[PDB]
């Protein structure tokens, strides 16, 4: 009713009565340039952040960081974590896959890419989605390969349905305030990697302030900038809640509300760093649908007892993750010889839109964040401060509140998957001990190699039976690998048509890595 307010006046309103008066002072009485940069930061990088609420978050999170957990019951979750476990369950997997494809066709699926991180650790000062792995004949960014996986899954859904309608997965790209513009530019310059512009939604997350432990004051990086840090993937809820321009222009609604109007039923969430990400996975989707789950998490067996990864647990009937620093944890089940706590968190989730909505509502009053003491660089020298994080898993305790009444068997499910098929995070520069681009590329090639050997062996049972058999023998004894474009195959399908060329190469002059791509690439 009082009309439009300047960005600065909105910031002033947001900081009034927030117990952070040193910031309010900077906004009201700082230099022109200081007032402006602080305004831009609080507006564009901390949009929606409730500063009073975060004082409570700091207080509680500090208290918490100063034994009820039980593992998932043996044999209680869907386990497809090896070749042998998948063989024994082949029909169930195929049936779930068909359910997932129907949902993709129906336009019910969104994929949310966590895209706030940079490639700085990889030696690349651009958003991580821009990163191009060496060692691949495809010269494609991580963003490009994600989009091609969506295109392929959409194409398969259409082939199964026979529908006249296009299968469309909504792509939600969760940027940072600082990297949003450059991310949109990259997509635009590349024609959205073959996607429709209308199915791609860019939305910026908010960072979280850092605090002095003794006083609870927000730390200043400099006179024009508060100390703030990426909040962790729990930022999704606030980010999906932010009002956006809405169409005839109407009152602003959230991306969440926009998705509900588009008929989205599930949101699959994953980090852009995962080279092996099974994007729009129809088995994951089919499992959620058939289980009537509001949350499904993907997990992997631990690599060994000392792997520094969080594991899923249930405590007092509530599901969550216990991080390696907080862990009985390394006990072995007597019968199987497997760790009792053996569902490692690979940050790959599928959530109902109802859950996304309810979790966001609950999170506004939620104060149990993860606090860490960190040395923080500032223009006045380093200081010790508190950083606060929250993760998707912190909200899973609310999952059964989505049903009235809750289901007897609950609405949370675990899907234990094969790590080497599903999880290859690109996090550390080549030459590091783990999670390097080369490590992820090795897993990718190993997976494609398995798919091609399988396709060749099926043909061994149009190409000549004996030539296919000979070609497989060449693959094995020469240790030939394959690299397969997602536009060709996302799960091992679609290779039959390529076998004449593959077989010719294998029998005449095999390269170290057979490259399979669409003719029009
Ligand atoms: C749904 C929602 C809408 C607005 C706000 C919130 C939520 Br949740 C907050 O309570 C939390 C917030 O913005 C926030 C911002 C970044 C985060 C984060 C939470 O978890 C880790 O990363 C908040 O302070 N404002």
DSSP per-residue string spanning 365-431: T----EEEEEEE--TT--EEEEEEE--GGGGGGGGGGGSSSPPTT-SEEEEEE-HHHH--B--S-TT
Q: What spacing in Å lies between the alpha carbon of 435 and ligand 1's midpoint?
A: 29
Mutating to test ligand 1, I would choose from 14, 56, 238, 253 the residue with most ligand atoms within 8 A of its C-beta, which is 238
User: Is the CB of residue 81 less than 8 Å from the CB of residue 266?
Assistant: no
What gap in Å lies between CA 259 and CA 66, rounded to an integer? 40
Phi, psi at residue 265, to the nearest 5°? Answer: -105, -35
Mutating to test ligand 1, I would choose from 44, 54, 206 the residue with most ligand atoms within 8 A of its C-beta, which is 206
**Minimum CA distance residue for ligand 1 atom 17:** 235
> Which helix (H) or strand (E) is 152 found in, with range?
helix 142-161
User: Is the CB of residue 386 less than 8 Å from the CB of residue 58?
Assistant: yes
CB atoms under 10 Å from CB of 432, counted, come to 14
What gap in Å lies between CA 477 and CA 455, rounded to an integer? 17
Phi, psi at residue 386, to the nearest 5°? Answer: -110, 125
Phi, psi at residue 429, to the nearest 5°? Answer: -60, 145
Residue 243 pairs in a beta bridge with 254
| 3-class secondary structure per residue, 94-131 | HHHHHHHHHHHHCCCEEEEEECCCEEHHHCEEEEHHHC
What gap in Å lies between CA 21 and CA 190, rounded to an integer? 45
User: Is the CB of residue 226 less than 8 Å from the CB of residue 42?
Assistant: yes
Instruction: Name the 3-class secondary structure at 341.
Output: coil
What gap in Å lies between CA 259 and CA 265, rounded to an integer? 9
User: Is the CB of residue 396 less than 8 Å from the CB of residue 414?
Assistant: no
Give the residue carrying structure tokens 């860490």.
372
What gap in Å lies between CA 171 and CA 158, rounded to an integer? 18
Residue among 85, 192, 79 nearest 146 (CA): 192
In a 10 Å sphere around its CB, with 0-12 CB exposed, 13-18 middle and 19+ buried, how is residue 237 labelled?
buried
Mutating to test ligand 1, I would choose from 114, 228, 359, 364 the residue with most ligand atoms within 8 A of its C-beta, which is 364
CA-to-CA separations, 81 to 84, 283, 298, 419, in angstroms, rounded: 8, 13, 10, 7
Site residues for ligand 1, CB cut-off 6 Å: 48-50, 53, 206, 208, 231-232, 234-235, 237-238, 241, 360, 363-364, 389-390
Resolution (A): 1.8
CA-to-CA separations, 24 to 12, 34, 51, 208, in angstroms, rounded: 6, 12, 12, 17
User: Is the CB of residue 203 less than 8 Å from the CB of residue 173?
Assistant: yes
DSSP category for residue 270: E
Q: What spacing in Å lies between the alpha carbon of 32 and ligand 1's midpoint?
A: 29
Residue 388 pairs in a beta bridge with 371
**Minimum CA distance residue for ligand 1 atom 13:** 49
349 is written with which tokens?
Answer: 């989730």
Q: How far is CA 2 from the centre of its chain?
A: 41
342 is written with which tokens?
Answer: 């053996």
What gap in Å lies between CA 51 and CA 53, rounded to an integer? 5
User: Is the CB of residue 312 less than 8 Å from the CB of residue 299?
Assistant: yes
Residue 222 pairs in a beta bridge with 225
482 is written with which tokens?
Answer: 């394959």
What gap in Å lies between CA 295 and CA 352, rounded to an integer? 7
Q: What spacing in Å lies between the alpha carbon of 112 and ligand 1's midpoint?
A: 17
50 is written with which tokens?
Answer: 């409730």
**Minimum CA distance residue for ligand 1 atom 25:** 49
In a 10 Å sphere around its CB, with 0-12 CB exposed, 13-18 middle and 19+ buried, how is residue 392 labelled?
buried
User: Is the CB of residue 112 less than 8 Å from the CB of residue 119?
Assistant: no
In sequence order, what DSSP letters do the residues of 463-521 get, joined into one string?
A: --HHHHHHHHHHHHHTT-EEEE-TTT-SSS-S-GGGHHHHHHHHHH---SEEEE--TT-
Q: Are β-strands 412-417 and 78-80 bridged in parallel, bridged antiparallel, or unpaired?
A: parallel
What gap in Å lies between CA 474 and CA 495, rounded to an integer? 18
Q: Are β-strands 481-484 and 109-114 bridged in parallel, bridged antiparallel, or unpaired?
A: unpaired
Phi-psi region of 316 (alpha: psi -120 to 50; beta: other; left: phi over 0): left
Residue 296 pairs in a beta bridge with 350, 413
User: Is the CB of residue 224 less than 8 Å from the CB of residue 37?
Assistant: yes
Q: Are β-strands 311-315 and 243-244 bridged in parallel, bridged antiparallel, or unpaired?
A: unpaired
> Which helix (H) or strand (E) is 200 found in, with range?
strand 200-204
Q: What spacing in Å lies between the alpha carbon of 106 and ligand 1's midpoint?
A: 31
Give the N- to C-terminal CA distance of the chain in Å, as an integer: 55
381 is written with which tokens?
Answer: 């020298």
Give the residue carrying structure tokens 């060749």.
456
Structural domains of the chain, with CATH: 1-521 (3.90.550.10)
User: Is the CB of residue 103 less than 8 Å from the CB of residue 289?
Assistant: yes
**Obtained via which technique?**
X-ray
């Amino acid at each position: 009713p009082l009309g439009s307010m300047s960005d600065r006046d909105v910031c002033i309103q947001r900081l009034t009565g927030a117990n952070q008066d040193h910031i309010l002072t900077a906004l009201e009485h700082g230099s022109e340039a200081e007032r402006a940069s602080l305004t831009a930061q609080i507006t564009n990088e901390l949009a929606g952040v409730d500063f009073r609420h975060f004082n409570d978050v700091l207080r509680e999170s500090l208290e918490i960081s100063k034994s009820l957990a039980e593992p998932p019951a043996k044999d209680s979750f869907f386990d497809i974590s090896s070749v042998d476990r998948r063989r024994g369950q082949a029909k169930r997997i195929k049936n779930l896959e068909a359910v997932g494809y129907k949902a993709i066709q129906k336009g019910q699926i969104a994929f949310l890419i966590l895209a706030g991180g940079s490639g700085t650790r990889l030696g690349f000062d651009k958003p991580k989605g821009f990163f191009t792995c060496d060692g691949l004949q495809q010269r494609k960014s991580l963003f490009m390969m994600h989009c091609e996986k969506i295109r392929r899954r959409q194409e398969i859904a259409e082939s199964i349905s026979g529908s006249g309608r296009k299968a469309r997965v909504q792509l939600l790209v969760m940027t940072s305030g600082q990297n949003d513009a450059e991310t949109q530019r990259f997509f635009e310059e590349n024609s959205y990697f073959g996607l429709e512009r209308e199915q791609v939604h860019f939305f910026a997350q908010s960072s979280v302030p850092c605090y002095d432990e003794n006083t609870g004051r927000i730390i200043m990086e400099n006179r024009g900038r508060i100390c703030a840090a990426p909040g962790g993937n729990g930022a999704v809820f606030a980010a999906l809640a932010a009002p956006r321009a809405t169409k005839t222009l109407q009152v602003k609604e959230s991306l969440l509300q926009h998705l509900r109007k588009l008929g989205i039923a599930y949101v699959q969430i994953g980090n852009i760093d995962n080279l092996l990400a099974n994007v729009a996975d129809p088995v994951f989707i089919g499992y959620a649908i058939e289980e009537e789950a509001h949350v499904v998490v993907k997990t992997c067996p631990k690599r060994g007892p000392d792997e520094r990864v969080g594991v899923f647990v249930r405590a007092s009937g509530k599901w969550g993750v216990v991080e390696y620093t907080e862990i009985r944890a390394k006990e072995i089940d007597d019968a199987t010889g497997e760790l009792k706590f053996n569902c490692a968190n690979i940050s790959s989730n599928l959530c109902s839109l109802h859950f996304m909505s309810l979790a966001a509502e609950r999170m506004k009053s939620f104060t149990q964040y993860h606090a860490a003491r960190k040395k923080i660089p500032t223009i006045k020298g380093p200081v010790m401060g508190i950083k606060l994080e929250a993760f998707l898993f912190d909200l899973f305790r609310f999952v059964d509140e989505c049903d009235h009444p809750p289901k007897d068997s609950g609405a949370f499910r675990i899907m234990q998957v094969d790590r080497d098929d599903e999880f290859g995070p690109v996090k550390n520069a080549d030459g590091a001990a783990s999670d390097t681009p080369a490590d992820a590329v090795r897993l990718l090639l190993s997976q494609h190699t398995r798919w091609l050997i399988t396709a060749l062996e099926t043909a061994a049972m149009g190409v000549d039976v004996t030539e296919a058999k000979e070609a497989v023998a060449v693959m094995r004894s020469c240790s030939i690998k394959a690299e397969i474009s997602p536009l060709v195959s996302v799960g091992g399908e679609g290779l039959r048509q390529h076998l004449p060329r593959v077989i010719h190469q294998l029998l005449r002059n095999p390269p170290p890595v057979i490259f399979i791509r669409r003719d029009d690439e």
